[PDB]
Amino acid sequence: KAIHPDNVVLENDKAIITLKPDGDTSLQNPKVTVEALADGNVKISNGTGEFTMSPSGEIKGGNRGGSFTLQPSGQLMCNGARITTSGRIITANGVDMDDFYQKYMS
Amino acid sequence: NRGGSFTLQPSGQLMCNGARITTSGRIITANGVDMDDFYQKYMS
């Protein structure tokens, strides 16, 4: 059988575990992949979707029709709607809940 | 997120930088305003 020139590969019929000298490690199979790269990258992935974390501290969910994204600045996001660090719920239509409340009660 | 948090507490209360979504779906914004409460004052 062939041998990889430089890689400690622990392998089964269709399940593979690969560790490379440069930090990167990866679990693979014909429909899933869980790789942890050297540069703080986590990219847990699947055919139906994926979840990843960037070195910049980002957290995202590849809903493929949605996104549970969290930006480095702490601004929660979901399909455009934002929740600022201060808890202001800025809906995708631009309406701020406190602003709309202020016009009421006038 | 180091500048944010997609936190989910054991009691099922979704949270994001203080803003909460209760188990019953009440969107309690960080400023304390409840969407249903603000809606009730409107339409009066």
Buried b (16+ CB within 10 A) or exposed e, B4-42: bbbeeeeeeebbbbbbbbeeeeebbbbeebebeebeeee
Do B33 and A101 touch, CB atoms closer than 8 A?
A: yes
Q: Is B32 on the interface with A (CB under 8 A)?
A: no
Q: What Å resolution does this PDB entry report?
A: 12.7
Query: Hey, which bits of chain A come out as E strands?
Result: 8-11, 16-19, 25-29, 32-36, 45-46, 49-53, 59-62, 76-78, 81-83, 89-90
Buried b (16+ CB within 10 A) or exposed e, A21-47: eeeeebeeeeeeebbeeeeeeebbbee
| Method by which the coordinates were obtained | cryo-EM
Closest residue in B to A73 (Cα) is B3
Neighboring chain A residues of B29 at a CB cutoff of 8 Å: 87-89, 97-98
Do B1 and A56 touch, CB atoms closer than 8 A?
A: no
